[model samples]
Target: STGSATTTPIDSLDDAYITPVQIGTPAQTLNLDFDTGSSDLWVFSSETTASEVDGQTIYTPSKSTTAKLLSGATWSISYGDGSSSSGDVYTDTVSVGGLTVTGQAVESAKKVSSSFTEDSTIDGLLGLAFSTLNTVSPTQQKTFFDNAKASLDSPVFTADLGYHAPGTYNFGFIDTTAYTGSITYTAVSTKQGFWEWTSTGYAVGSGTFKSTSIDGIADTGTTLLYLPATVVSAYWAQVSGAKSSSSVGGYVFPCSATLPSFTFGVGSARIVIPGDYIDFGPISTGSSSCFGGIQSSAGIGINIFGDVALKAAFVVFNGATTPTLGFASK
Candidate 1:
């Protein structure tokens, strides 16, 4: 049971793309963010408060005969900010990329935070992380991928993110035509409840690849790439007007400054990101201050290989008994 689906970005920055997911018997189609950064297949539903459901499609379990409430079950996922979404749980037929999973835990959001209100295009989040991270209580549920992997042709899914364009998600098998060159395999640390792995090294532009081990997670939900502060500082230093601004809240630089490529190693394979991709459009005020796609992970304590990095490569999430990761150039 393998299938392919498309996800489109909300903005030209390609911040986070959303793919259509089929929920319930009548199949209420909702565009949801596929997040490897968290594990909880939650959604905006009929039970959600009016304030948070603003302009977004809601999944009404009342219409789906397949929907069954999990007795005394509840889920709550908090963000970096204090705000969060918490609600009752329902088991229902859920489908994605043409692959279906029976009795998949559908967290019907009762109350939601303001963060999700920023984007009306996204109705909810579809988590691709491990089941260990599922926040549901009274019996933690399996992830959509976890529930469907047993019958999968290869028990794997791949992400082919685009640069300022639509991207694809393939289940059960790899889309051979989506990438070029051989796919390199790497072991992942599920202990962290994430697609955590060690990035071999990094290089600035055409510079030498620094042989250093950088531990991080491949997070599809995150928009920016985060690395060690020193590495981030070095890259920003190369730009003429780049500086760490307390006012802008991060590193910002002259919009017209010469941009450089960023390179990172995945085992023996090296993925290169072009100069243009390193710079998103200019910041809020005007064209002079542009935010750097790459930032420093100083206080976060962990590096993040977010969409800024994932967009440059084809990534595979191997759902084996012990999950692994695969990377390839596209």
Candidate 2:
């Protein structure tokens, strides 16, 4: 059967969105961040030591009759941001938005990095990425979507992310009413376990669309849009008071700067990011400077189209075959 769920951004943390997911029989629900950047359905669980646990809720497998330990199986994941979690594995009945999958691998974290323990809002992460990226050892595990796709009429999911608002994630079916205009489809290269594609071109503001190819991934977990250093430099050139700030990190500009709209090509279709979205709030120091949402991905060696970029369009993550990405105006 088809399923759907809505996710909303955390109050202070505008970075990631979360949805409720049931992890065992009788339905032990937890708020999980559905991340497309990595693969692994890990959570703070009974296995986590008290010192490693904080204000977040824990998933207890013992309470579920359907929980079964997968002996000798283990998982360890390290996020790009230094956040990490490692644990033993269990196969349990997992459900999301009314869709149920039996014997889904649920990694119970025995240890977690401070980055995760400190975040009280995030109980765990549900990987929406390709199963090839799954970190569970012995034998890699399939994601909930991967296991449930055969039963679905369409092996597709749509991400509707919002700015400080609640958004919906639809599975098995596409709601035409959710997006406007026609969807622009592009080929996705999943070799890296990411929705990677090459943009035909890009432009700063209303200027000419320079014919430049940008290879990047569509990552829902990443908060900012990261491009090449040269491209970032070109965009900031249009901002009068923009400067590289060591104190705040990344590039910053006066809070009142009239930023230009950045446009990226998806085949013949163009997705334009408004200037207001580029200003990613003011610095934490209470200064009159605002940090840019677009930064350089040179250090990471891969450009990322994160939340800031994805929210500007209605994204269809087609998983049926060939894994194409379809984008349209929201």
Candidate 3:
């Protein structure tokens, strides 16, 4: 089977990409953030505490005839930003783009932290990471991709995230036309339940390519790119008025400054991220400063190739017996 779905940035600042997923019988659609960093297909549901519900559309299991509650099952998950959501589990029909998976584990939220409620654009999350990262306890359930993989033409998916325009997510088969040139693959270590890999090296624009071995995960849920402080400092040094400010947080620079392009090697292929991508956006309305898309991973311990980097290349996640990642310039 083959399925395709497209998504776009939530707003002008490119905070996060979102897609509407069909859940349950009669198909109630909710805008969901397809997060590859996690593996629990959770949703804001009728069971969610009413006080925490904002302008989001909730998944009411009682209204769906195909919904079935999983007895003695529950799930709870916290993000790096200190946000969390928890509730019971259900077995229902779930679809992304044109792909459908029956008996998919749908974690219904009973309570969600304020951080989750604050963003109404994301009704819930559809976890695309490995099944092992699932938060369900007593009996952890499989992710949508895990359940749908076997029945597809191929057990793989691709991410084509765009900058200000719309991008797509394809399942089952690779969309060769979506990328340019041949793809170079690298091994992915899922021991920690993430699509983590080691990059060959990096470069600053047309400068020499440094053979720095970088280990990181390709995360779509995260908005910006994160690398070692050495790389972070080097990129910003080329920009005038750039500084790592304690007052505004992270690195900040004049909105009109020219930023040097950053390139990272993947299996000998140098995929370049244009400086405009790293320039990000204005810090706030009427502010002359902008935030840096590329930040340091010193605190996190591992680099994160977030949307800022994903938008620069076509990424393929091969979920075969031996997982791997395919990188191609588009």
Q: Please count the clashing residue pairs in each candidate, in the order shown.
A: 0, 0, 0
> Where does candidate 1 have its weakest 10-residue lDDT segment?
280-289
Model 3: number of backbone collisions: 0
- Model 3, runs deviating above 4 Å: none
lDDT, candidate 3, equals 0.90
Residue-wise C-alpha lDDT for candidate 2, range 1-330, written one tens digit per residue = 888988989764367888899888788999999898888899999889789888888999999999999999999998657777899999999888988889899999999998888888899999989999999998899998898898777999889988779898888988899999999999999999988999888899999998889999999988999999999999999999899877777999998898999999999999998887787777876879888999999778999999889988999999967889999988
Worst-scoring 10-residue span by lDDT in model 3: 76-85
Residue 301 lDDT, candidate 3, scale 0-100 = 84
Cα displacement (angstroms), candidate 1, residue 106, comes to: 0.5
TM-score of each: 0.98, 0.97, 0.98
lDDT of 1 by residue, 183-264 (tens): 9999999888999999999899888889889999999999999999988988888889899988877888889787899999
- Number of the candidate with higher TM-score, 2 or 3: 3
lDDT of each: 0.91, 0.89, 0.90
RMSD of 1: 1.0
